[PDB]
Amino acid sequence: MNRGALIKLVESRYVRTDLPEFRPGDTVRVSYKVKEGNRTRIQDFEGIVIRIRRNGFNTTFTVRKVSYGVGVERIFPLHSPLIQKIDIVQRGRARRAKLYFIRNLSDREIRRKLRADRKRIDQDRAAERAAKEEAQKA
Amino acid sequence: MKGILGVKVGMTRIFRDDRAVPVTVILAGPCPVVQRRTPEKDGYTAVQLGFLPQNPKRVNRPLKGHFAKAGVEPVRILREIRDFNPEGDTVTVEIFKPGERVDVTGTSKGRGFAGVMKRWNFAGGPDSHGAHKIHRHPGSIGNRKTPGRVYKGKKMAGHYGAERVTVMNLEVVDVIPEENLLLVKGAVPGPNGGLVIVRETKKAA
Amino acid sequence: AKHPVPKKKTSKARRDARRSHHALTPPTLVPCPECKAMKPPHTVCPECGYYAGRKVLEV
Amino acid sequence: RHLKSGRKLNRHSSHRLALYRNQAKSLLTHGRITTTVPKAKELRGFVDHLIHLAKRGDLHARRLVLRDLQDVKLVRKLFDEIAPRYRDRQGGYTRVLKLAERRRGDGAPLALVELVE
Amino acid sequence: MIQPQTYLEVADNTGARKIMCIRVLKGSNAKYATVGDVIVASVKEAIPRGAVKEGDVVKAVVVRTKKEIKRPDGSAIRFDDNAAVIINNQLEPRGTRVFGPVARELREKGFMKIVSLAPEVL
RNA sequence: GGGGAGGUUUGGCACCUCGAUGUCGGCUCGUCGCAUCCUGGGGCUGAAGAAGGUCCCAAGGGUUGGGCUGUUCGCCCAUUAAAGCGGCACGCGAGCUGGGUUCAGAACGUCGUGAGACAGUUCGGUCUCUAUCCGCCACGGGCGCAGGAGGCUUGAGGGGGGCUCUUCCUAGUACGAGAGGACCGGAAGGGACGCACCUCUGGUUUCCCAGCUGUCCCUCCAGGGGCAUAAGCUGGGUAGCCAUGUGCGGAAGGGAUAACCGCUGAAAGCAUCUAAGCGGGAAGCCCGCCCCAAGAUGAGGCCUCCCACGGCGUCAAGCCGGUAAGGACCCGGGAAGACUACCCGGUGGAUGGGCCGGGGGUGUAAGCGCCGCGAGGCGUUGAGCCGACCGGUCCCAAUCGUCCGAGGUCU
RNA sequence: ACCGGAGCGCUGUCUCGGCGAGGGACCCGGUGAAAUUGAACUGGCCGUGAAGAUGCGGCCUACCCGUGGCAGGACGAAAAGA
RNA sequence: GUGCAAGAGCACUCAGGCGCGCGGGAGAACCCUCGCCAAGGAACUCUGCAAGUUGGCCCCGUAACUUCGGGAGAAGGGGUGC
RNA sequence: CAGUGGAGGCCCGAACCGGUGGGGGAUGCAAACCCCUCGGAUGAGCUGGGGCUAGGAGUGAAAAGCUAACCGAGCCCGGAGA
RNA sequence: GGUGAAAAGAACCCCGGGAGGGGAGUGAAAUAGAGCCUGAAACCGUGGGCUUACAAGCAGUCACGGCCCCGCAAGGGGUUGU
């Protein structure tokens, strides 16, 4: 039997690896859904975020977002029924992972305490056309 | 009335067809089909089943390398499945087919002597208006001067945990003979390294 | 001294039974290799000593 | 069963740590230290681990380990001498060996830290 | 969770703004509620000029809960509040102006009247 | 108008209790009873169907949350399929509560010339941790099972378990003027509840990371230590432990029965569910479910294992030292545990500690570069550490070894 | 620091309790009380009895002894009954 | 002695002084005492008993009534480090 | 109207007296005590000293409280072997 | 309160830190050994005999069996299997 790790890491054949890379900064656009008595839709639910519970297979993300009424938080099971999920802005530069403190006061203080890392962009722009060099070289 | 032994690990959530599902992972493995027991020299039909091979110097002795065919025992000795009798070859895992409810034996993991409102769940109560003491006390047990005899099995504070039990209704869609595993609805008792065994369902049997 | 009092004097029989489960247990000892005499199981007797022999400093 | 993690203990937390690292100090000064049993156990574990992170020689280990310590002449004796010894050993640099007869007045089996090299 | 003591503001006009939970409607022991749960109520907060006065004892069904919801599809969500939709003795939303998000879960339960005008089904 | 059970209320009698048994409800644990409130059943109607009225059958399980009143009695709401009636010091202060009760204090209504007293009121007012036997809830030791031992088991006994609703399809069809609105077969879901798990959700984690404050110290800075909880303080938080989270269970089925309906049929040429025989009949009885269980002194049975005399008794049983299969001590200790027990492994080994890769937590740390006089910033960088976790790995401890244990009743 | 009644913010008072923490207890080690005490070889139903039994009786479960724990009985100790 | 508005407060600690005249191991229930708690927020209860929020310093402001002292710090709210 | 002055059986608040509601403890650390809080808080104040007032008597910001740990009439001995 | 006629009141060896004893030596005698003539009862130990690990007890009684030990016989102690 050995390694229980080995076991559950072999249970990993329902793995996504093409899925976007992010930090617990912001996020934004889209997720998924069903929407009907016959599904046929995925909701483009944007948000920020808050909680990255790490695990691997069962690792999930608490996504904080606000609308029309007030606050609301969607957790997603990181792996399958998520069609595409892809965020927008990503940003970064928070202090920690858990961001409950933002639930209390979510306003001009929030945009105040948030700033993207140019490093992020610069790396997505390095990734940008070192991928048309990879659409050229190898 | 079929079945095969198993050992416990993990309980995830893979999404079959659409929905999302909790999944117990047990290793059913190759289990020595060591001999049957017969209604004349016994009273019923039963099959001894071994398991996971390691036993070398340590176990030896009558072995039941005697028995009738040897083969050497696992490391998890052997048990029996009641009213059971396969073909005669040492069976493995996929003795069952995916998408079926069945039953399971397991050693509930031990806990030791524990609370009264914990073991059974009483109520207790007295936080601030009551008393500091009788937080976790059974309150009351008997009567006055008649009958006055404390009842046998008065549901008391003591050990809870290290027990054993069969269990009905478990849907298994997953199984990996290619390593000897069995993934089911997920509920199995015991620690991740204890006794489990799969028998067949009883929804109408 | 409270409410649950030993209502009556307990017998000599009960004395001797409650003290039946008492008793002692003898010591457990084995020899000292590369030496001569005892040492309890898993010990480095000062006079004797385990492998390599540490201490052994007395008079 | 309220112990399915383990760890040997008894005392205050302050008491625990302070002790641990003090026994360490006393050992690093010498080599063979008389004491009790559970002490002996997670003492040997702890301290040996300490000597493995002191097996190298960066300011990292220096401060960090000595943050969890105090003595600096002993920082010399460690970073400059004890480490270049067990240098070619990446396992238990210490072995604590037990004593019979027990501690008298209150029968307590004893043991002893060793230099093991 | 919704015990019979909680305030529940309204996600609609009707002539109300906040209430207090009275019982539920499930089993005479089901003393707990969540999304789409049929709940009896006493308003305790209703703005002057509507069709339901402050205090008045009426009924409701609940959506938007401080208690997160775990669907049969592993996904989840919690609402920052304890809102609801108010109804009469004939099951139907009295008001009309629905505010904020709602769970599509309710939709399959069968309160489509809200779902139809719902500005954010989630 | 008579007759009667029931021993719950309210009266009578006053014997164990004056070398004490502490009165009202509630907390909390139940538990016995059916004249049964929901649920099953059938009988019947001043019963169309829908519901109701009523009488027997039947404890299997169940029978809510509150407002006020010290208050059981009570009223009231929101509900339920329903909101039971009762016994046991009107159960349970060596268990709570001491709120109500007949203490002294004080006041008030009231009676008395007054001290003071009034089945008049008011406010506050000390139930007392160590269980001896029994009883009970688990845990063992010693023994026993008329060769010693290891493992798989039998199930006699006994313990647990039994609720119910919601919309739907059949079908607005049968019955009905309409309004209405059904058997039954099936379905989909909730709640109350007992067991199992951490995979998610959510709560944790006492030194596992980061922040900061007053501070004494190392060593002035940088850096770091305790202290300030019994962790200074907050921000997080794994495994293990948990509920709300999560998978399940009550059942599906065989047989006997309840009142009740029927078959064939007599006395009693007709009749009949009856005295013989057949049949239907309930969540109810018995199994089919789940644990304990051969002290089930019947001490069951299977799969083996080792084997006989070795020393006095020739005869009849004893006994008696070392060996056999084995086992005990001790140790590594263990999702197992109050000690014990259990269980795992002990150099022929992955048990604990070290180590290192997977995994998890934190968020660029110690120093270095490069800016602004400076709080700090950017780079070095997802780095540095790193509790339990999955394993790899003999580096260190499971040493050397010690003692017991068939020598085989009989018919 | 007096007795009611009501609203606001807050909270383990309650639902429904889970985890952890140090200290008692539990194992070892040194010492070692008490009130009560006729003796006890001290289980249960259905009746018996000056009214409420292990002990009487027609009758019950169970080898011997112990350890942790709960608190119903011994008309339970505190009194020659407030 | 350093520090907060201050101080014979408090944390730390000068100098001086001590480790409370039995300890070693488990890591049970249960009891002392302490923290965190999703979600509801007096529903529990004779009683918000009790814990738990607020707190200190300055800026704003403060109802009724009043014997002009008060009521007050009313309530309600804004900052504080470097 | 400004100010200075600087009052109070003034008020918030240390040792100091006190003891409220809670709890611990109950063969206690203890024949009335620790922990959390509460109150006075420059006065009708807290307190070492020396002297007197004492059993139908004294002392009483007043209960029939207090007078060498039991005060509706002290302790000691004697009638008294009531 | 009592050693003995009287101190002859215990040297020397031995284990032991001492204490206390094991021998010796003393006297009529150390069962007179130093709070020592006598030393009982309740009382706590150690050896042995009989009996006890399926069993319901105001603990004994009447009979019978098992048994062990005194007994010439006859009997007797004892003990308890039913």
CA separation for the pair A87, A26 (Å, rounded): 9
DSSP E93: B
CA of E10 to C1' of H75 (A): 30
Q: Is A77 on the interface with B (CB under 8 A)?
A: yes
Distance from CA of D60 to the nearest CA of C (A): 36
SS3 state of residue D64: helix
SS3 state of residue B129: coil
Q: Is B193 on the interface with D (CB under 8 A)?
A: no
Return the half-sphere exposure (C-beta side, CA atoms, 13 A cut-off) of residue C38: 7
Q: Which of residues 25-44 of C touch D (CB under 8 A)?
A: 39-40, 42-44
Give how far Cα B149 sits from Cα of A24, B146, B158, C5, Å. 64, 8, 20, 20
Query: What residues in E contact A35, CB-CB < 8 Å?
Result: 104, 121
Which pair of structure tokens corresponds to residue E62? 């609940």
The candidate with the shortest Cα–Cα distance to E58, out of E25, E35, E100, E29, is: E25
Which pair of structure tokens corresponds to residue A73? 């938080």
The neighbouring-strand residues paired with E79 are: A72
What kind of experiment solved this structure?
X-ray
CA separation for the pair D97, D100 (Å, rounded): 10
> In this structure, are residues D43 and D20 in contact, taking their beta carbons and an 8 Å threshold?
yes
Cβ contacts of A116 within 8 Å, gap of 6 or more: A25, A89, A90, A91, A92, A93
The candidate with the shortest Cα–Cα distance to E14, out of E116, E83, E78, E110, is: E83
CA separation for the pair E14, B95 (Å, rounded): 62
User: Using the beta-carbon criterion (under 8 Å), do B52 and A1 form an inter-chain contact?
Assistant: yes
Which pair of structure tokens corresponds to residue B18? 């659409």
> In this structure, are residues A41 and A50 in contact, taking their beta carbons and an 8 Å threshold?
no
Strand G neighbours among B 152-191, CB < 7 A: 156-158
CA of B140 to C1' of F45 (A): 52
CA separation for the pair B40, B37 (Å, rounded): 9
CA separation for the pair E122, E112 (Å, rounded): 14
Which parts of chain C fold into alpha helices (H)?
12-18
Contact, E27 CB vs strand F, < 7 Å: yes
Q: Is D5 on the interface with B (CB under 8 A)?
A: no
CA separation for the pair D86, D51 (Å, rounded): 9
